[PDB]
Amino acid sequence: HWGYGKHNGPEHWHKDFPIAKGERQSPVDIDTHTAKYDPSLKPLSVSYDQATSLRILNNGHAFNVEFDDSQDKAVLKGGPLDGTYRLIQFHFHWGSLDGQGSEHTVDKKKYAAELHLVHWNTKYGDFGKAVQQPDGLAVLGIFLKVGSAKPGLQKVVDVLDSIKTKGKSADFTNFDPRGLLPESLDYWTYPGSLTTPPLLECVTWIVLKEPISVSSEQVLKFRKLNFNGEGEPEELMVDNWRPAQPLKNRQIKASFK
């Protein structure tokens, strides 16, 4: 099975998923001096007031905080997006050390972790159909740096003990994702893909420039999770990030000047 190790990591993914060497793969390095302000970009709208979280799951490569997307309760619109995208789940990518962990990089700088809020275009009916379209998904990427603790993240941190191993899940209702957002919504955007197999190229990426700060204690809890299942030797869940991929024929646009 694919993973992040020496024998099953990102450099091996192309064998089972040829698109790994595709034309619009993610993540990418965001060269701030090459990105251009785009006046055509509309205001970004993040409406998470009615968000309904339901469960948190350790899927063997990260943990997903799942939401009820049977209706428009938590949606992302505006910006480079046409239409409405519904929040289905969010997860993170982090490192074994604070100096690495993010997937996207800014002028080659790696952050301690990166949050991905995944949304699907409602015009396609369901997530499965959306990932078969070039404009099927919109992922809001948020960088995490180590410093002061993030109050809105503690609820996630404290429940990780109950889903330490692969396959474990726990009820996780009433979690407000608004507490994970930085102050500013300034962002960079480009067309890309899922960063984990099947690496489908159906994502409009919206990466916020302002990182949120989390405490060393909070990130350390992330690093206590396991890639392995219960009853198997312990493999700490760390460095579950894919490196930057070639930008190729793409242009990264900035929402700010």
Ligand X SMILES: N[C@H](Cc1ccccc1)C(=O)O
Q: Least distance from C-beta 110 to Zn ion, angstroms?
A: 15
Which residue number, 21 or 42, has a Cβ lying nearer to ligand X?
21
Q: Least distance from C-beta 64 to ligand X, angstroms?
A: 5
Contact partner, 64, from Hg ion, Zn ion, ligand X, none, Cβ < 5-8 Å per class: ligand X
Token representation of residue 235: 């493999």
Confirm if 236 and 166 have CB atoms less than 8 A apart. no
> Of these residues, 14, 61, 104, 119, which one is catalytic?
61
Annotate each residue in 178-217 with x if it binds Hg ion (CB under 5 A) or - if it does not, as one string: ----------------------x-x---------------
Token representation of residue 104: 């996207």
Spatial distance between the Cα atoms of 58 and 65, rounded to a whole number of angstroms: 9
Confirm if 159 and 170 have CB atoms less than 8 A apart. yes
Q: Is 58 in the site for ligand X (CB under 6 A)?
A: no
Confirm if 102 and 93 have CB atoms less than 8 A apart. yes
Q: Least distance from C-beta 199 to ligand X, angstroms?
A: 8
Span 190-209, contacts to ligand X by CB under 6 A: 196-198
Confirm if 190 and 253 have CB atoms less than 8 A apart. yes
Confirm if 54 and 67 have CB atoms less than 8 A apart. yes
Which residue number, 60 or 192, has a Cβ lying nearer to Hg ion?
192
Q: Is 25 in the site for ligand X (CB under 6 A)?
A: no
Q: How many residues bind ligand X (CB under 6 A)?
A: 5
- State the chain's maximal CA–CA distance in angstroms: 55
Q: Name residues whose C-beta falls within 8 Å of residue 60's C-beta, 6 or more positions apart in sequence.
A: 1, 3, 166, 167, 227, 229
| Residues paired with 109 in a beta bridge | 106
Among 116, 150, 242, 253, binds Zn ion (CB under 5 A): 116
Residue identified by tokens 């972790």 is 113
Q: Is 228 in the site for ligand X (CB under 6 A)?
A: no
Confirm if 225 and 236 have CB atoms less than 8 A apart. yes
Say if residue 1 carries a ligand binding annotation.
no
Considering only the stretches 66-74, 114-122, 221-229, 244-252, report the one whose residues sit in contact with Zn ion under the rule CB under 5 A: 114-122
Which residue numbers belong to the known binding site for Zn(2+)? 91, 93, 116
Which residues of the shown chain bind Zn ion in the complex (CB under 5 A)? 116, 195
Contact residues for Hg ion (CB under 5 A)? Answer: 200, 202
**Which residues are near ligand X by CB under 6 A?**
59, 64, 196-198
